[PDB]
Amino acid sequence: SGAIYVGNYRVVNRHLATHNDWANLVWEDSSRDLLVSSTTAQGCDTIARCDCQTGVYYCSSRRKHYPVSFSKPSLIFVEASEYYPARYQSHLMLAVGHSEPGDCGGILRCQHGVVGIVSTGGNGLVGFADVRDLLWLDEE
Ligand SMILES: Cn1nc(C(=O)N[C@H]2C[C@H]2CO)c2ccccc21
Ligand SMILES: [Zn+2]
């Protein structure tokens, strides 16, 4: 579990969105595993606007933040799961690290701010849904 709270937006993994998220929908994209809903209170997170390929992610199954090197956001083949058929996920970045399904939602961050959230993994690899290109998270 986990979300990014920036301005009046809550950014969560689309496959973990609640009924309340769907009833206050702002934007969703299945190919990116992302859903954004509106909030009452303002959020404290800032979105990174950079091209960092090194950062730190939160791993709930270890209660630890790990430094990682990660690939540039791309279209990657992701295996069938209880949430999606075996399809290509877009804007996905890969790093060598520990993760389990419930680690989804952990923030990946750099010196500039929040870069993305845990979305895929298995076998020593963790994948993050990039959010740096979503310039509209900073305004409105
Ligand atoms: C971080 N993480 N996430 C998933 C996962 O199954 N996510 C579901 C949304 C769909 C994408 O494949 C996973 C599995 C096994 C180890 C790690 C994992
Ligand atoms: Zn950065």
Cα torsion for 41, 32, 124, 77, to the nearest 10°?
Answer: 170
50 lies in the same domain as 98: yes
Q: How many domains does the chain have?
A: 2
128 lies in the same domain as 87: yes
The rounded distance, in Å, linking the Cα atoms of 65 and 58 is 4
49 lies in the same domain as 37: no
Amino acid at 19: H
The Å distance, Cα 55 to ligand 2 centre, comes to 8
Other CB atoms within a 10 A radius of the CB of residue 10 amount to 21
88 lies in the same domain as 133: yes
33 lies in the same domain as 13: yes
The Å distance, Cα 50 to ligand 2 centre, comes to 5
Residues with CB under 6 A from ligand 1: 15, 33, 78, 81, 83-84, 99-101, 103-104, 118, 120-122, 126
69 lies in the same domain as 97: yes
Other CB atoms within a 10 A radius of the CB of residue 70 amount to 23
24 lies in the same domain as 82: no
Strand 74-78 relative to strand 87-96: parallel, antiparallel, unpaired? antiparallel
116 lies in the same domain as 75: yes
107 lies in the same domain as 95: yes
The end-to-end CA distance of the chain, in Å, is: 26
* 112 is annotated as contributing to ligand binding: yes
The domain of 39 spans 3-44
33 lies in the same domain as 101: no
29 lies in the same domain as 49: no
